[PDB]
RNA sequence: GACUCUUAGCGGUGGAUCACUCGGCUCGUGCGUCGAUGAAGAACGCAGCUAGCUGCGAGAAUUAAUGUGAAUUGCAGGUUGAUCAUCGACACUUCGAACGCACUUGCGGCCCCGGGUUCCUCCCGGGGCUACGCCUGUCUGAGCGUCGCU
RNA sequence: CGGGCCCAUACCCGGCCGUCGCUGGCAGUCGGCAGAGCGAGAAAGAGAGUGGCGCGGACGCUACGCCGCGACGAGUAGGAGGGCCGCUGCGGUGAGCCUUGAAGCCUAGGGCGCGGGCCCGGGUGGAGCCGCCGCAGGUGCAGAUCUUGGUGGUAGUAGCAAAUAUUCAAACGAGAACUUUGAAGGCCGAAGUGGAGAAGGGUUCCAUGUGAACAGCAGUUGAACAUGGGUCAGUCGGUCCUGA
RNA sequence: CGGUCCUGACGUGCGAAUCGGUCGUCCGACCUGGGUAUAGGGGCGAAAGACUAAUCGAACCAUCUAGUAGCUGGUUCCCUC
RNA sequence: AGUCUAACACGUGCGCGAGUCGGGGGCUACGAAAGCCGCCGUGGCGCAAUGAAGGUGAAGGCCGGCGGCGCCGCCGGCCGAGGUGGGAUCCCGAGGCCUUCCAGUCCGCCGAGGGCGCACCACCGGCCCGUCUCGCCCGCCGCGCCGGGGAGGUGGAGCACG
RNA sequence: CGCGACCUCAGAUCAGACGUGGCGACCCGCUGAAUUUAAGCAUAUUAGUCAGCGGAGGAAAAGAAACUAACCAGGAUUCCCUCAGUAACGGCGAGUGAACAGGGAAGAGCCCAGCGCCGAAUCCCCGCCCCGCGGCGGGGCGCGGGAAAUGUGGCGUACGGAAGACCCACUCCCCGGCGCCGGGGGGCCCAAGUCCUUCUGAUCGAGGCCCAGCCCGUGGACGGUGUGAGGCCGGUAGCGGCCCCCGGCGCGCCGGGCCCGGGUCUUCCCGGAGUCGGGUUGCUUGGGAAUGCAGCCCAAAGCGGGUGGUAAACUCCAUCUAAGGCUAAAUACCGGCACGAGACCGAUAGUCAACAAGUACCGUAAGGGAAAGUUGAAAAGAACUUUGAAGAGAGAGUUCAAGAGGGCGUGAAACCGUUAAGAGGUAAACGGGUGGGGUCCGCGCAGUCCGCCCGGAGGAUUCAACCCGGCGGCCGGUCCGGCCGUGCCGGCGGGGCGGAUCUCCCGCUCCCGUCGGCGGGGGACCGCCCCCCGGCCGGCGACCGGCCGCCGCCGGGCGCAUUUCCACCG
């Protein structure tokens, strides 16, 4: 149950802030779980997607065990590309089919400093939740 | 509804003549909504039949009396097994109805040794048929945040607090409530007694204290005593075939003409 | 139009009297803020009472009422020089005055005069520099016990 | 056999019902802040492709700074911080209490600069002033108003 | 004047429905620990004491229930009672229903109820819905020259009739009564159907392209639509003056 | 500039006052553009209660206002007494 | 398209009851709910009416004596809060309810006649307040334009075990 | 004549400031109707209300008695309950209508003029120097300039004050800056299944995950994700974490202002005028021989003046001190900036406006003012072939579905086309009764069964009785033991509560360590209740334990087939 007086438990006030949310909140929605290896190695469960991350596909039509590289972040749509999900269209030109972020496991992250603070960050604020915890 | 609501255009009816129904009409322009009918309930637009208000009597009162004597109820349908399975708690593994546990329990601080506590209570079928109740409810209520609905659990009554509401909180169907402020809203729920209630030792004890006996008043209020029984002897059966009763009848007739 | 036997009746509602309507929706918020206000002001003045000034005993006006005591506004001044406060100084440790009240019994003034006596009696008064105590003001033993009362202070009851 | 009526199937016209809801209505809470340092309101302009809505003001779908940290997207285009959010520095067209006089966007006056002159006057451009009432102080005045000296 | 005959919801006999009355009957389902009853003209005991083998017996009674006797049944204005009649939302309850298919809609399908209405079957549809106990209400339409929206007959009908008038050939074009060019016949007739301005309009002006919509037939045409262009002043006027 | 008569045409018209023939006046109390003044119990009127933006024996716009109506119209499911 | 608010009247259901009611205030996610306060019951309504008002404000009798038959007071004591009629129910009981016949014992039932009578109804008395008439007695800090009392009529939205 | 003062009055694009206009939900001051009611209507009512005008704030206004009362008296203002639909007003009709006292929320008081005393002891401005500087302030210096004696500052204000004398007491106040010690706004973060199998176009559906009943839970609110998710994502809980900026409560420091009191006695001082009050007129009020306000005329006093709800004279009391000023809180809020929620409406509803809505459009103008939501999960929005000038078709393809084809969810009625069936000279239509034909249903087409008995064929762990063990139901006329009472009686018992039942000490005040008074604490008694002990009554059918007895059931033996039971046949 909720209790703090000055967040909504209104559905239309929630779906209105998630649809009209800016830029720098879409990143914060457009997250998706690190996958088991990694998630062991990092202690972090999920990291907001980057443009050029190696990534699956757990459910739909196109779900399988091949690994695939990002290629956009549709932060629009709230759609990711993938550099082999795609369809046929009638022409005979290829366009890629978006997909939900949540729907999809993280592999291999592309790493630079700032991706290392966001990692270092999570794994030390679950050190001492778990260390509050225990 | 808003109070002018209805009543934003200027109109006025065209009068007798114009083969028009009298009502009153949009004055003028060059647009759609022109002569089309404005006030009165039966067009569209326009104040509806009598306008709600916000000073509707939204509130009752209720004597402090019968408040209590209806406190005193429940808790007395509360400590019946077939009032109770018949409100349809699955109460049939409960060792002793008034359920009583040591005051150890006031000290829980966990969701995992809570749960622990109602397995080994066995009043873990209740919050099971709560999980299976769970469902989506029906009708316009659901864009109201009235979305989902669930069964009403067992009721946990404690003395005063040590983090148990913090243990219980988390469980779907349990409600937690202080001994000296029971209220009916939560005692009966929809109007129906018997509601499968669990107390600590504690707040038994103090119960008692609270709601006064029938020779000794209720130290904890000012004034109080328990209301009276109109009819002492309710086993009907055994008044009718007692002998001094069965005595004093004339013979049946069950002969059928 | 009234019809058989009934009670005829005078309703005050001839003049616009929905355009004012005062609910009380807002009574339960009304009594929250005033007892955060109330908490506020208790804790805000630490050690002293959290009702404010002691206040005197008083007569009720009428025939009606004149059987029975009650809370004035302040003591008088008659009061104060037969108690040997100031006037000036009874404001500041917190005793009620005004130069309304008159004195036409010596019961009553003799009343309010030992009322005064008892609180002056009774009150435990802090240095204003703690490092350095003074004539008039209590020792440590004292300090440390000083704690709000709630209520009145001195309560009357007849 | 044509035409007419009823019924059912199918197909039209039409948008009822049902289910949805980034909208309202009501109640309650905290705060409770405009303007001559130019407000509210109006007009006109600004995007590579842009009409309306929105944002903005000749620095014109924004600059600077802080935070976040890899995008915007309908189509093109080319990590020492793209985009968003915040917003404390800068900037802010013409009207409008609207302020040089009028309200055509017409006509001026004073001062100082750069073209002209080589200040000798014109003429061109730029910048700073040029409203009403009123308070304090300053300067210049007035009166067969009350006096004093000569 | 006589026999016979015909029929109303009236009268008689019978069945069923409801209402009213008897403020009628039933706790007695008292069973091997047992002994079957209270209906029959005429008050009140299946009264108690003291002396002279085989293990058996239907249904019933949600008492707000069930059962039995009689009588009765018109109805506007109006009153009252009962609705397991119907609609929307809330509190409880149904270990309720639901993508193996909810709501809604159609149905020469099967039924139930006196009725309000309801339940199944078939099809369509694609995401929610309902039963019982209580609570609340913006709660049930055939009418109001009712409001809003849509659709008919009239009806392929009335009409496309004020100011004299058209014709031949060719070109483009998928397509010509209407476009264009040439020829003929006509009209306005210099107070014009001519050439130019003021107020007013505001891009209608010019070229190309199109022929969805509009130009009450048609259009290869347009004041339509889409792309692009176009208004040059010391000496035309405002600007200045004053008039009411 | 005006509007007699045909009481003609039309009268869901070309037109919410138009059309035709016939008519009155045509150097004046003449016709007319622009500017300007008079505003609603007010203006203005060679005077018809005429005109004052298709509205005049008291314009138009918003509000008081959901004005009052002993008067017309309507008033939504079933059965039972 | 008979709604909501307020008032009133009666009828029904509930709690308490000569009392009842916190509605205003105060103390302690749902919860703006709930619980509590009694020297927070101030207050409202009810428990007393009547008069314009000053005001007044809801049973008596008997026994025995003294004084001015009877009446009044000092006294002491006792009875003590109506009556008539109709009244649902309850109480008593002349007798009787059989299995052969007699007597008597316990329980139960019926019943001639006779009673204590609920609520309510009618009638007759009584008491309180206003008013009228007739009358004589009583009290004293102030002896008075003082205070109190009786008998009989009549006016009241009164009393007569809430 | 000239010059110099002061007084009144001018001009400045003189130096430095200030006002204007907007919004207006709440507030203050004026102005002020008529619909309506009275069953007509004129006073009255509507109503000091709408319209109109002016002026502000975060609140405004009011406010510390020229008060209420008549008591054993209270004591600024504002708000709530009650007073009370009352006193009173009213063609005494319709109607209207307070306040005092009481209980509460809040609670805070003060300052001038005047009379006096202090060498104007007072204030503003320009210049330099030092510091501070986004609230223009502090300090030093000017034979610097003004204001002011037609009156500035200090003391001082009705509660009395001042001065002097006599006693007692005191060195704890405030600010300009500096340095130190621990709520608000913002940012980034912190638990657990995408486990196995199986539905689907797609899973968030269904089953399972043991003896740890998968894992987390101080987190099972919500939203998103291809239906329906506590564990996929954001979030949610937590006195959880980190990082930025601001304020207050405190600390010492440097400097600055100020050297500050009380009690008694004596001597002095002491107040607001065209105002009060009176007459008249008009409005207003519940205010009635005049409640408040305003105009005109008259027009004061100082043991005075006002008030004491009926006009006036006389006479006593009571109570305030008008004609000058400031002041927080409790209180109001349909505008504005953020919020949170709802037994509310769900696109003819809810705001006029869910959408490029005060928009399109209309009117010369003031103003008037709409209609309009939904493909799909994802455009995957139909390549390509072909007839036609083309709109538009026939094929192919996407999709789970085109039966979703760009006003595309579902797709009703009116109305229309076509197919099939039937029928057709008294318009059609309708009620009752049949007949005929259709489309469908019964998945009808050899007809019901259920128990007992006789007979015929068969097969069993197989019946009764008996033994062991377990459980259960009813009992012991009067078995032993317990518990309970809307039960009682005992008590040389131990207590909590209450009493409008009585009576040792302490505090206060009244007296020359004392007689006697008041409040409080201590004890006695009474009443209730809880507990320890004892004794009877009843109950355990809202409330039992052991033993014994009977009966019943179940499991296992032993029983072995003229018993019992299974399935068929007549
Ligand atoms: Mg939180
Ligand atoms: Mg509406
Ligand atoms: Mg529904
Ligand atoms: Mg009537
Ligand atoms: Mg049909
Ligand atoms: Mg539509
Ligand atoms: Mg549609
Ligand atoms: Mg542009
Ligand atoms: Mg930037
Ligand atoms: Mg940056
Ligand atoms: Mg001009
Ligand atoms: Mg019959
Ligand atoms: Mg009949
Ligand atoms: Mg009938
Ligand atoms: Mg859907
Ligand atoms: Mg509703
Ligand atoms: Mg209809
Ligand atoms: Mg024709
Ligand atoms: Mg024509
Ligand atoms: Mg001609
Ligand atoms: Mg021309
Ligand atoms: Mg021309
Ligand atoms: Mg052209
Ligand atoms: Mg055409
Ligand atoms: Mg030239
Ligand atoms: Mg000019
Ligand atoms: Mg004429
Ligand atoms: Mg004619
Ligand atoms: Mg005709
Ligand atoms: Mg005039
Ligand atoms: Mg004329
Ligand atoms: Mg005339
Ligand atoms: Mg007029
Ligand atoms: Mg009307
Ligand atoms: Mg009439
Ligand atoms: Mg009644
Ligand atoms: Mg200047
Ligand atoms: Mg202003
Ligand atoms: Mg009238
Ligand atoms: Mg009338
Ligand atoms: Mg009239
Ligand atoms: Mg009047
Ligand atoms: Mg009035
Ligand atoms: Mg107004
Ligand atoms: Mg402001
Ligand atoms: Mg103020
Ligand atoms: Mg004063
Ligand atoms: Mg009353
Ligand atoms: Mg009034
Ligand atoms: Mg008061
Ligand atoms: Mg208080
Ligand atoms: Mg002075
Ligand atoms: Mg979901
Ligand atoms: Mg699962
Ligand atoms: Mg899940
Ligand atoms: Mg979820
Ligand atoms: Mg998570
Ligand atoms: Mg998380
Ligand atoms: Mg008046
Ligand atoms: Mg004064
Ligand atoms: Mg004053
Ligand atoms: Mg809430
Ligand atoms: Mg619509
Ligand atoms: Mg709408
Ligand atoms: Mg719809
Ligand atoms: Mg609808
Ligand atoms: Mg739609
Ligand atoms: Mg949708
Ligand atoms: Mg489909
Ligand atoms: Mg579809
Ligand atoms: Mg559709
Ligand atoms: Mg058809
Ligand atoms: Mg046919």
Redesign the pocket.
């Known amino acids: ?16 802030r ?3 949310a ?12 690190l996958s ?1 290896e990694l998630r062991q190695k990092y202690n ?3 990291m ?4 050029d991350d190696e990534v699956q596909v ?6 399988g065990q091949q690994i695939g590289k990002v290629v ?7 759609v990711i590309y993938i550099e082999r999900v795609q ?1 046929e ?4 030109t290829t ?1 890629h ?7 999809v496991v993280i592999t291999r992250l592309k790493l ?4 290392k ?2 990692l270092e ?2 794994a030390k ?2 050190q ?3 260390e ?2 225990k | ?11 006025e009816s065209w009068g ?2 114009r ?5 009153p009409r ?14 009165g ?17 939204w509130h009752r ?1 209720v ?7 209806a ?1 005193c109820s429940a808790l ?1 349908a509360s400590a019946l097994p077939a009032l109770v399975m018949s ?2 708690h ?1 109460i049939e593994e409960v060792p002793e109805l008034p359920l009583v546990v040591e005051d150890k329990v006031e000290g829980y ?4 040794e809570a ?2 506590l109602l ?1 080994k209570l066995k009043a ?2 209740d919050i ?2 709560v ?3 769970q ?15 669930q ?2 659990g067992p009721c946990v009554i404690y003395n005063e607090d040590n983090g148990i509401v ?2 219980f ?4 169907g349990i ?1 937690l409530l202080n001994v ?7 005692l009966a ?4 007694v018997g509601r499968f209630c669990i107390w600590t030792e504690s707040a038994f004890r103090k119960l008692d204290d609270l709601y006064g ?4 008043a209720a130290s ?4 109080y005593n328990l ?3 109109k009819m ?1 002897n ?5 008044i ?2 007692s002998p001094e009763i ?3 009848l ?8 | 139009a009234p019809s058989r ?3 005829i ?8 009297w929905q ?1 004012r309507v ?10 929250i ?3 955060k ?2 908490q506020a ?1 208790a804790r805000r003045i630490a050690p002293r009472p959290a009702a ?2 002691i206040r005197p005993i ?11 005591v ?5 003591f008088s ?1 008659e009061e104060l020089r037969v108690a040997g406060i ?3 100084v009874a ?1 500041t440790i917190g005793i ?7 004195n ?2 010596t ?2 003034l ?1 009343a309010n005069v ?1 009322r005064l ?1 008892e609180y002056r009696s009774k009150l435990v008064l802090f ?3 703690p ?2 105590p ?2 008039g003001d209590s020792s440590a033993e004292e300090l440390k016990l000083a704690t709000q009362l709630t209520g009145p202070v001195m309560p009357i ?2």
């Open positions: 149950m909720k209790f703090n007086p000055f967040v909504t438990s209104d559905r239309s006030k929630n779906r209105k998630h649809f009209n800016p830029s720098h909140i879409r990143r914060k929605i457009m997250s998706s779980p088991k972090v469960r999920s907001p997607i980057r443009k757990v459910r739909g039509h196109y779900k956009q972040v549709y932060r629009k749509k709230y369809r269209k009638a022409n005979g366009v089919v978006g997909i939900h972020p949540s729907k630079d400093k700032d991706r603070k966001i960050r999570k604020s679950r001492v939740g778990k509050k915890g | 509804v808003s109070e002018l609501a209805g009543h934003q255009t200027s109109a007798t003549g083969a028009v129904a009298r009502i949009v004055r003028g322009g060059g647009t759609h909504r022109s002569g089309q009918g404005a006030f309930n039966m067009c569209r637009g326009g104040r509806m039949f009598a306008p709600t208000k916000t000073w509707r009597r009162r004597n402090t009396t019968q408040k209590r004597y406190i007395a409100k349809g699955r601080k966990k969701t995992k749960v622990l397995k873990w079928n099971k048929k999980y299976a109740s469902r989506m409810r029906a009708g316009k209520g659901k864009m109201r945040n009235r979305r989902r609905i069964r009403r913090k243990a909180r988390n469980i779907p409600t000296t402020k029971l209220n009916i809203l939560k729920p929809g109007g129906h006996t029938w020779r000794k904890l209020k000012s004034n209301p009276m029984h002492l309710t086993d009907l059966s055994r009718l075939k069965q005595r004093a004339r013979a049946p007739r069950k002969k059928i003409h | 036997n009934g009670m009746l005078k309703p005050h509602f001839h003049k616009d355009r005062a609910t009380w929706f807002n009574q339960p918020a009304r009594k803020r005033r007892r206000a109330r002001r404010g000034p008083v007569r009720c006006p009428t025939v009606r009422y004149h059987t029975k009650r809370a004035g506004r302040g001044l100031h006037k000036k404001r009620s005055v005004d130069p309304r009240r008159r036409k019994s019961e009553s003799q030992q006596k240095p204003r520099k490092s350095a003074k004539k009851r007849n």
